[PDB]
């Protein structure tokens, strides 16, 4: 449930948007979620905190 929620929220916010991706992309996303789970409170905080100047999409990307 958590994995599916992350996939939905990070890639459009709708199930169809996630299904628009390929199986390999979904595998990549789920393995990144597993990475986050393993990191938890001792891993680097750049996995969820966007450093200033980063070119990657922000929280308002789909808004």
The site for other proteins (CB under 8 A) is made up of: 2, 4, 6-7, 9-11, 15, 18-19, 21-32, 34-35, 38-43, 47-59, 61-62
Distances (CA, A) of 15 to 11, 20, 21: 9, 9, 10
Shortest distance in whole angstroms from residue 45 CB to other proteins = 8
Which residue is associated with the tokens 């979904």? 26
Which residue is associated with the tokens 């916010």? 13
Shortest distance in whole angstroms from residue 63 CB to other proteins = 10
Q: Are 50 and 20 in contact (CB under 8 A)?
A: no
Shortest distance in whole angstroms from residue 61 CB to other proteins = 5
């Amino acid at each position: 449930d958590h994995v599916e929620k992350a996939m939905i929220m990070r890639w459009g916010g709708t199930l169809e948007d996630v299904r628009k991706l390929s199986a390999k992309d979904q595998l990549r996303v789920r393995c990144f979620t597993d990475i986050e789970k393993l990191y938890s409170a001792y891993g680097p905080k750049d996995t969820y905190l966007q450093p200033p100047g980063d070119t990657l999409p922000g929280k308002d990307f789909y808004r």
